[PDB]
Every structure is written in structure tokens, then in C-alpha cells.
Amino acid sequence: AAEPAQLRIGYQKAVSSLVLAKQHRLLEQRFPRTKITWVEFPAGPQLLEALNVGSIDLGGAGDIPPLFAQAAGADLLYVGWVPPTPKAETILVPSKSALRTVADLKGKRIAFQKGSSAHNLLLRVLAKSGLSMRDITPLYLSPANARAAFAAGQVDAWAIWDPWYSALTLDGSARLLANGEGLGLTGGFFLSSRRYATAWGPFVQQVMGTLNQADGLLERDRAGSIKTLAQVSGLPPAVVERTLAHRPPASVQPLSAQVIKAQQATADLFYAQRLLPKRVLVAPAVWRA
């Protein structure tokens, strides 16, 4: 049959591969009869609130945003899985700070996006030192607002991802306190409207196919990728370079059994810790073409 009239797809500037897909017009080249409209979000929870009201029909986010969206009653599907990039998920402290270990975060004001992958990174890191979310004071801030609070001396630590990690550690603004290595982080997801994925399954599968290829650009086209990403983000090439050093390959592919289980275990944890109101059931939201 047909392909859809339009694909309004959400993305985050942080995700170097989607930025490349956007600038290289990969989707437009693949689907000439479909109007492709990319819509940028500050982070994943923002992007999910838009999916829930229909502002987009497909978008990429961390493992946590969809859990918070499901908990609030969103009827989304998981349609693709993005392997994790644990070096790129970090707790930062101002470089001038006396904080040097995770234990030193007890009683401190920590900025992060609520319901983002950094919320789960913080939870899991703190728990290794016997701290919980109730032992720290959260400042729920978007990445730009958190960067400004950090610049202004208002936060003790900031849980955040690349490229803010690479940018601030390279310019001397911050020290790494902890990253996501060793936590068995899940990674992230492509989320869709249940109506759109039901109507246009093959098309969504083919979309994921093309985005799976875009990720390869960061390896197959290293130098070209750096200058383009530098150009687009306006970040220094050295910073962009550092962000690529932190990422193993991470192409979107189908959800595996172990990934679904990992995702339900995170839902169970967030509920157990009173960070979500409902227990969330992940499996009935999983889709495969």
C-alpha cells in the first residue's frame, strides 16, 4: 500500500546520529512521498510530552522518559532500542569544588532533568554509596537551565550527558565525579504513537533501518562527522571529538528479551523508590514489525 503523508519526528541535538540524519537528509532521500519534519526538544521528557499530545509521532529518548510517560497514562509504543553509552552519562561537579567522591554528595543540591536518563544514573550511583534520592536535594532543570545554574554557582553537582560533559570538562568548568560504566544501563529507545505504528508498521521499521545506518556515520565518516556536528552545534571540534571517544557503536535495533526485562526492572526500581506513582508494565507497550 501507501506510506504516510507526513512524519513529524522528534529529536535531541545531543544525539549526534540524528543530527547527521537530519543534515544529510537520509529520511527525505528514502521516503520521497513523505514530508519529513524534524522537531528539536531540550531532553526526553519534553519530547515525550509532545508525543502524548500528538505534536510528533516518533522520537528518540533515554530509558527513563517513557517510564514516566507510561506512569502518567501515555499510550506509547517502544519500536526500537538504542544501546547504552555509559561513558557519556555523568555526574559533574564544579572544578573548584571540595566534592571528590559520590559519598560527598550527601546533603547537596544536584541539578538534573526529572524523568531523564540522568535521574536513573543518579539513583544508581548514589545507591552504591548508600545514598538515596532523599539524601540529596534535586534541582529539576532542563539542560540549558541547569548549565546556567551551574555557571552561576547555584548547584553542587549536575547529572547530565554529552556534549555538556565533554564541553565543561574540556573548558575547565567541571570535574567528572562518576559516569555510567558498570551499572548495566539499558540505553535508550525510539517511541511512537500507537496509532501511527499500527497504521504504518513497515514504514516505521524502514525509518528505524535508516536511522540505524546514520549511527554508523560517526565511525564510517569520522572526520566529516566532526566538522558537521561542530558546524551545526557551534561546539569546538575538539569537544565533538571527545563526545565520539565516549560512544561505542549504538545503532537503533529491535528490542530484545533482555532489554525489555531490563526496562521493566528499572520501572520496578523507580516504583520501589517512590519515584513513580504507578508500577509501570513495559511489555504490553513493546512493538516489533
Side-chain angles (χ1 to χ4, degrees), residues 42-72:
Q46 291 94 331
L47 189 153
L48 276 281
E49 284 288 359
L51 177 75
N52 185 55
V53 298
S55 289
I56 57 172
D57 287 335
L58 187 59
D63 60 327
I64 313 305
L67 289 175
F68 273 64
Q70 284 188 278

PDB file of all heavy atoms in Angstrom, residues 42-72:
ATOM      1  N   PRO A  42      14.625  19.849  24.188  1.00  0.00           N
ATOM      2  CA  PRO A  42      15.756  20.017  25.123  1.00  0.00           C
ATOM      3  C   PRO A  42      16.246  18.682  25.728  1.00  0.00           C
ATOM      4  O   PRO A  42      17.437  18.499  25.943  1.00  0.00           O
ATOM      5  CB  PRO A  42      15.241  20.977  26.203  1.00  0.00           C
ATOM      6  CG  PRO A  42      13.840  21.195  25.955  1.00  0.00           C
ATOM      7  CD  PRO A  42      13.455  20.652  24.562  1.00  0.00           C
ATOM      8  N   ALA A  43      15.328  17.753  25.910  1.00  0.00           N
ATOM      9  CA  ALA A  43      15.617  16.461  26.522  1.00  0.00           C
ATOM     10  C   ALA A  43      14.404  15.554  26.285  1.00  0.00           C
ATOM     11  O   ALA A  43      13.472  15.916  25.599  1.00  0.00           O
ATOM     12  CB  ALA A  43      15.848  16.633  28.071  1.00  0.00           C
ATOM     13  N   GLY A  44      14.467  14.330  26.816  1.00  0.00           N
ATOM     14  CA  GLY A  44      13.476  13.260  26.540  1.00  0.00           C
ATOM     15  C   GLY A  44      12.100  13.459  27.115  1.00  0.00           C
ATOM     16  O   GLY A  44      11.110  13.171  26.433  1.00  0.00           O
ATOM     17  N   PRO A  45      11.996  13.940  28.384  1.00  0.00           N
ATOM     18  CA  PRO A  45      10.664  14.119  28.954  1.00  0.00           C
ATOM     19  C   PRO A  45       9.817  15.138  28.145  1.00  0.00           C
ATOM     20  O   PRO A  45       8.677  14.900  27.943  1.00  0.00           O
ATOM     21  CB  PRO A  45      10.959  14.677  30.369  1.00  0.00           C
ATOM     22  CG  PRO A  45      12.376  13.963  30.663  1.00  0.00           C
ATOM     23  CD  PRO A  45      13.061  14.221  29.366  1.00  0.00           C
ATOM     24  N   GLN A  46      10.492  16.148  27.600  1.00  0.00           N
ATOM     25  CA  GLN A  46       9.889  17.194  26.782  1.00  0.00           C
ATOM     26  C   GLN A  46       9.318  16.597  25.525  1.00  0.00           C
ATOM     27  O   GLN A  46       8.132  16.853  25.158  1.00  0.00           O
ATOM     28  CB  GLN A  46      10.898  18.328  26.499  1.00  0.00           C
ATOM     29  CG  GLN A  46      11.258  19.161  27.768  1.00  0.00           C
ATOM     30  CD  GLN A  46      12.480  18.657  28.447  1.00  0.00           C
ATOM     31  OE1 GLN A  46      12.797  17.463  28.383  1.00  0.00           O
ATOM     32  NE2 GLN A  46      13.207  19.569  29.083  1.00  0.00           N
ATOM     33  N   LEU A  47      10.159  15.777  24.881  1.00  0.00           N
ATOM     34  CA  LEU A  47       9.856  15.039  23.666  1.00  0.00           C
ATOM     35  C   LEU A  47       8.723  14.070  23.869  1.00  0.00           C
ATOM     36  O   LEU A  47       7.846  13.986  22.997  1.00  0.00           O
ATOM     37  CB  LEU A  47      11.107  14.278  23.247  1.00  0.00           C
ATOM     38  CG  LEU A  47      11.018  13.605  21.823  1.00  0.00           C
ATOM     39  CD1 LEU A  47      12.374  13.470  21.214  1.00  0.00           C
ATOM     40  CD2 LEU A  47      10.338  12.309  21.928  1.00  0.00           C
ATOM     41  N   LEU A  48       8.697  13.386  25.025  1.00  0.00           N
ATOM     42  CA  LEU A  48       7.521  12.533  25.334  1.00  0.00           C
ATOM     43  C   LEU A  48       6.186  13.273  25.640  1.00  0.00           C
ATOM     44  O   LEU A  48       5.081  12.816  25.268  1.00  0.00           O
ATOM     45  CB  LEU A  48       7.842  11.586  26.506  1.00  0.00           C
ATOM     46  CG  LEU A  48       8.563  10.244  26.259  1.00  0.00           C
ATOM     47  CD1 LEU A  48       7.568   9.249  25.739  1.00  0.00           C
ATOM     48  CD2 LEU A  48       9.679  10.383  25.298  1.00  0.00           C
ATOM     49  N   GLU A  49       6.264  14.445  26.211  1.00  0.00           N
ATOM     50  CA  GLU A  49       5.047  15.181  26.470  1.00  0.00           C
ATOM     51  C   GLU A  49       4.464  15.577  25.127  1.00  0.00           C
ATOM     52  O   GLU A  49       3.252  15.583  24.951  1.00  0.00           O
ATOM     53  CB  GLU A  49       5.419  16.483  27.199  1.00  0.00           C
ATOM     54  CG  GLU A  49       5.766  16.277  28.697  1.00  0.00           C
ATOM     55  CD  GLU A  49       4.575  15.938  29.624  1.00  0.00           C
ATOM     56  OE1 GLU A  49       3.408  15.870  29.164  1.00  0.00           O
ATOM     57  OE2 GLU A  49       4.841  15.698  30.838  1.00  0.00           O
ATOM     58  N   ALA A  50       5.324  15.963  24.209  1.00  0.00           N
ATOM     59  CA  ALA A  50       4.880  16.249  22.797  1.00  0.00           C
ATOM     60  C   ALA A  50       4.313  15.023  22.112  1.00  0.00           C
ATOM     61  O   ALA A  50       3.352  15.114  21.345  1.00  0.00           O
ATOM     62  CB  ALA A  50       6.030  16.868  21.962  1.00  0.00           C
ATOM     63  N   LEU A  51       4.926  13.852  22.265  1.00  0.00           N
ATOM     64  CA  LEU A  51       4.349  12.665  21.615  1.00  0.00           C
ATOM     65  C   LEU A  51       2.962  12.440  22.167  1.00  0.00           C
ATOM     66  O   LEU A  51       2.066  11.962  21.419  1.00  0.00           O
ATOM     67  CB  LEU A  51       5.253  11.410  21.870  1.00  0.00           C
ATOM     68  CG  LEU A  51       4.823  10.050  21.360  1.00  0.00           C
ATOM     69  CD1 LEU A  51       5.087  10.155  19.891  1.00  0.00           C
ATOM     70  CD2 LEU A  51       5.766   9.040  22.045  1.00  0.00           C
ATOM     71  N   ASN A  52       2.759  12.759  23.468  1.00  0.00           N
ATOM     72  CA  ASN A  52       1.497  12.396  24.103  1.00  0.00           C
ATOM     73  C   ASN A  52       0.370  13.258  23.594  1.00  0.00           C
ATOM     74  O   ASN A  52      -0.760  12.788  23.477  1.00  0.00           O
ATOM     75  CB  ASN A  52       1.567  12.516  25.621  1.00  0.00           C
ATOM     76  CG  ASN A  52       0.318  12.041  26.288  1.00  0.00           C
ATOM     77  OD1 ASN A  52      -0.120  10.929  26.085  1.00  0.00           O
ATOM     78  ND2 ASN A  52      -0.265  12.897  27.104  1.00  0.00           N
ATOM     79  N   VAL A  53       0.660  14.536  23.313  1.00  0.00           N
ATOM     80  CA  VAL A  53      -0.348  15.418  22.711  1.00  0.00           C
ATOM     81  C   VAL A  53      -0.381  15.356  21.178  1.00  0.00           C
ATOM     82  O   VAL A  53      -1.070  16.172  20.524  1.00  0.00           O
ATOM     83  CB  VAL A  53      -0.184  16.852  23.215  1.00  0.00           C
ATOM     84  CG1 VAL A  53      -0.398  16.873  24.698  1.00  0.00           C
ATOM     85  CG2 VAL A  53       1.169  17.412  22.826  1.00  0.00           C
ATOM     86  N   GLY A  54       0.345  14.434  20.556  1.00  0.00           N
ATOM     87  CA  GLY A  54       0.318  14.441  19.066  1.00  0.00           C
ATOM     88  C   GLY A  54       1.154  15.423  18.243  1.00  0.00           C
ATOM     89  O   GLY A  54       0.975  15.457  17.001  1.00  0.00           O
ATOM     90  N   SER A  55       2.068  16.183  18.886  1.00  0.00           N
ATOM     91  CA  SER A  55       2.914  17.208  18.265  1.00  0.00           C
ATOM     92  C   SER A  55       3.958  16.491  17.390  1.00  0.00           C
ATOM     93  O   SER A  55       4.536  17.083  16.484  1.00  0.00           O
ATOM     94  CB  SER A  55       3.716  17.958  19.372  1.00  0.00           C
ATOM     95  OG  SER A  55       2.802  18.724  20.039  1.00  0.00           O
ATOM     96  N   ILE A  56       4.278  15.250  17.755  1.00  0.00           N
ATOM     97  CA  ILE A  56       5.170  14.387  16.951  1.00  0.00           C
ATOM     98  C   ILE A  56       4.560  12.993  17.037  1.00  0.00           C
ATOM     99  O   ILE A  56       3.760  12.730  17.927  1.00  0.00           O
ATOM    100  CB  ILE A  56       6.614  14.400  17.526  1.00  0.00           C
ATOM    101  CG1 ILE A  56       6.627  13.936  19.027  1.00  0.00           C
ATOM    102  CG2 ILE A  56       7.295  15.780  17.269  1.00  0.00           C
ATOM    103  CD1 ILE A  56       8.068  13.746  19.540  1.00  0.00           C
ATOM    104  N   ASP A  57       5.033  12.072  16.237  1.00  0.00           N
ATOM    105  CA  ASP A  57       4.501  10.727  16.206  1.00  0.00           C
ATOM    106  C   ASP A  57       5.584   9.676  16.444  1.00  0.00           C
ATOM    107  O   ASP A  57       5.287   8.500  16.614  1.00  0.00           O
ATOM    108  CB  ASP A  57       3.847  10.522  14.861  1.00  0.00           C
ATOM    109  CG  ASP A  57       2.579  11.270  14.758  1.00  0.00           C
ATOM    110  OD1 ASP A  57       1.981  11.533  15.798  1.00  0.00           O
ATOM    111  OD2 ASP A  57       2.151  11.580  13.672  1.00  0.00           O
ATOM    112  N   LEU A  58       6.854  10.118  16.416  1.00  0.00           N
ATOM    113  CA  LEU A  58       8.011   9.269  16.599  1.00  0.00           C
ATOM    114  C   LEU A  58       9.129  10.096  17.217  1.00  0.00           C
ATOM    115  O   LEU A  58       9.292  11.284  16.852  1.00  0.00           O
ATOM    116  CB  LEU A  58       8.479   8.707  15.236  1.00  0.00           C
ATOM    117  CG  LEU A  58       9.588   7.651  15.155  1.00  0.00           C
ATOM    118  CD1 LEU A  58       9.266   6.363  15.923  1.00  0.00           C
ATOM    119  CD2 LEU A  58       9.751   7.271  13.696  1.00  0.00           C
ATOM    120  N   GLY A  59       9.910   9.529  18.139  1.00  0.00           N
ATOM    121  CA  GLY A  59      11.039  10.321  18.681  1.00  0.00           C
ATOM    122  C   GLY A  59      11.982   9.468  19.511  1.00  0.00           C
ATOM    123  O   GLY A  59      11.596   8.374  19.948  1.00  0.00           O
ATOM    124  N   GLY A  60      13.226   9.948  19.685  1.00  0.00           N
ATOM    125  CA  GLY A  60      14.229   9.210  20.455  1.00  0.00           C
ATOM    126  C   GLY A  60      14.425   9.752  21.836  1.00  0.00           C
ATOM    127  O   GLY A  60      14.567  10.988  22.030  1.00  0.00           O
ATOM    128  N   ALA A  61      14.552   8.871  22.798  1.00  0.00           N
ATOM    129  CA  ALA A  61      14.781   9.352  24.170  1.00  0.00           C
ATOM    130  C   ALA A  61      15.538   8.300  24.937  1.00  0.00           C
ATOM    131  O   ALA A  61      15.673   7.149  24.458  1.00  0.00           O
ATOM    132  CB  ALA A  61      13.466   9.577  24.826  1.00  0.00           C
ATOM    133  N   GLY A  62      15.947   8.674  26.153  1.00  0.00           N
ATOM    134  CA  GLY A  62      16.551   7.774  27.186  1.00  0.00           C
ATOM    135  C   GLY A  62      15.613   6.651  27.653  1.00  0.00           C
ATOM    136  O   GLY A  62      14.480   6.561  27.254  1.00  0.00           O
ATOM    137  N   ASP A  63      16.071   5.829  28.583  1.00  0.00           N
ATOM    138  CA  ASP A  63      15.275   4.707  29.020  1.00  0.00           C
ATOM    139  C   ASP A  63      14.171   5.189  30.008  1.00  0.00           C
ATOM    140  O   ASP A  63      13.039   4.670  30.068  1.00  0.00           O
ATOM    141  CB  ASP A  63      16.166   3.668  29.666  1.00  0.00           C
ATOM    142  CG  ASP A  63      16.931   4.132  30.870  1.00  0.00           C
ATOM    143  OD1 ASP A  63      17.371   5.301  31.028  1.00  0.00           O
ATOM    144  OD2 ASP A  63      17.228   3.229  31.727  1.00  0.00           O
ATOM    145  N   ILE A  64      14.464   6.262  30.738  1.00  0.00           N
ATOM    146  CA  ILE A  64      13.517   6.788  31.768  1.00  0.00           C
ATOM    147  C   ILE A  64      12.315   7.603  31.301  1.00  0.00           C
ATOM    148  O   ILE A  64      11.188   7.428  31.901  1.00  0.00           O
ATOM    149  CB  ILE A  64      14.276   7.563  32.931  1.00  0.00           C
ATOM    150  CG1 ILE A  64      15.491   6.747  33.443  1.00  0.00           C
ATOM    151  CG2 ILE A  64      13.302   8.056  34.071  1.00  0.00           C
ATOM    152  CD1 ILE A  64      15.103   5.281  33.899  1.00  0.00           C
ATOM    153  N   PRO A  65      12.492   8.457  30.257  1.00  0.00           N
ATOM    154  CA  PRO A  65      11.327   9.276  29.847  1.00  0.00           C
ATOM    155  C   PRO A  65      10.032   8.466  29.550  1.00  0.00           C
ATOM    156  O   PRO A  65       8.945   8.824  30.079  1.00  0.00           O
ATOM    157  CB  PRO A  65      11.818  10.045  28.648  1.00  0.00           C
ATOM    158  CG  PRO A  65      13.362  10.302  29.005  1.00  0.00           C
ATOM    159  CD  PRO A  65      13.733   8.916  29.600  1.00  0.00           C
ATOM    160  N   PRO A  66      10.134   7.356  28.795  1.00  0.00           N
ATOM    161  CA  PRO A  66       8.923   6.614  28.536  1.00  0.00           C
ATOM    162  C   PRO A  66       8.281   5.999  29.756  1.00  0.00           C
ATOM    163  O   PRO A  66       7.069   5.820  29.762  1.00  0.00           O
ATOM    164  CB  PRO A  66       9.319   5.535  27.516  1.00  0.00           C
ATOM    165  CG  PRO A  66      10.832   5.502  27.506  1.00  0.00           C
ATOM    166  CD  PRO A  66      11.300   6.853  28.037  1.00  0.00           C
ATOM    167  N   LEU A  67       9.076   5.658  30.780  1.00  0.00           N
ATOM    168  CA  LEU A  67       8.549   5.109  32.020  1.00  0.00           C
ATOM    169  C   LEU A  67       7.708   6.196  32.695  1.00  0.00           C
ATOM    170  O   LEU A  67       6.592   5.976  33.183  1.00  0.00           O
ATOM    171  CB  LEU A  67       9.722   4.656  32.909  1.00  0.00           C
ATOM    172  CG  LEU A  67      10.450   3.398  32.415  1.00  0.00           C
ATOM    173  CD1 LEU A  67      11.696   3.079  33.308  1.00  0.00           C
ATOM    174  CD2 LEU A  67       9.487   2.242  32.285  1.00  0.00           C
ATOM    175  N   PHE A  68       8.252   7.405  32.711  1.00  0.00           N
ATOM    176  CA  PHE A  68       7.459   8.488  33.316  1.00  0.00           C
ATOM    177  C   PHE A  68       6.236   8.764  32.493  1.00  0.00           C
ATOM    178  O   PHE A  68       5.232   9.024  33.049  1.00  0.00           O
ATOM    179  CB  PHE A  68       8.297   9.781  33.485  1.00  0.00           C
ATOM    180  CG  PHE A  68       9.067   9.833  34.770  1.00  0.00           C
ATOM    181  CD1 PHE A  68      10.083   8.905  35.030  1.00  0.00           C
ATOM    182  CD2 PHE A  68       8.822  10.823  35.730  1.00  0.00           C
ATOM    183  CE1 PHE A  68      10.790   8.934  36.254  1.00  0.00           C
ATOM    184  CE2 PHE A  68       9.577  10.857  36.965  1.00  0.00           C
ATOM    185  CZ  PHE A  68      10.533   9.910  37.209  1.00  0.00           C
ATOM    186  N   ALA A  69       6.324   8.774  31.159  1.00  0.00           N
ATOM    187  CA  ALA A  69       5.128   8.946  30.301  1.00  0.00           C
ATOM    188  C   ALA A  69       4.044   7.871  30.467  1.00  0.00           C
ATOM    189  O   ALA A  69       2.879   8.230  30.637  1.00  0.00           O
ATOM    190  CB  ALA A  69       5.551   9.061  28.833  1.00  0.00           C
ATOM    191  N   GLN A  70       4.425   6.571  30.460  1.00  0.00           N
ATOM    192  CA  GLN A  70       3.524   5.441  30.805  1.00  0.00           C
ATOM    193  C   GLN A  70       2.887   5.616  32.169  1.00  0.00           C
ATOM    194  O   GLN A  70       1.646   5.448  32.318  1.00  0.00           O
ATOM    195  CB  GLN A  70       4.332   4.155  30.800  1.00  0.00           C
ATOM    196  CG  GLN A  70       4.665   3.628  29.396  1.00  0.00           C
ATOM    197  CD  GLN A  70       5.302   2.244  29.432  1.00  0.00           C
ATOM    198  OE1 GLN A  70       6.480   2.122  29.647  1.00  0.00           O
ATOM    199  NE2 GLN A  70       4.476   1.177  29.231  1.00  0.00           N
ATOM    200  N   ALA A  71       3.670   5.941  33.190  1.00  0.00           N
ATOM    201  CA  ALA A  71       3.111   6.197  34.520  1.00  0.00           C
ATOM    202  C   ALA A  71       2.020   7.264  34.559  1.00  0.00           C
ATOM    203  O   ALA A  71       1.100   7.214  35.407  1.00  0.00           O
ATOM    204  CB  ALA A  71       4.205   6.536  35.490  1.00  0.00           C
ATOM    205  N   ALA A  72       2.140   8.258  33.684  1.00  0.00           N
ATOM    206  CA  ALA A  72       1.170   9.340  33.629  1.00  0.00           C
ATOM    207  C   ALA A  72      -0.008   8.961  32.739  1.00  0.00           C
ATOM    208  O   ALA A  72      -0.871   9.792  32.547  1.00  0.00           O
ATOM    209  CB  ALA A  72       1.828  10.639  33.162  1.00  0.00           C
TER     210      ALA A  72
END
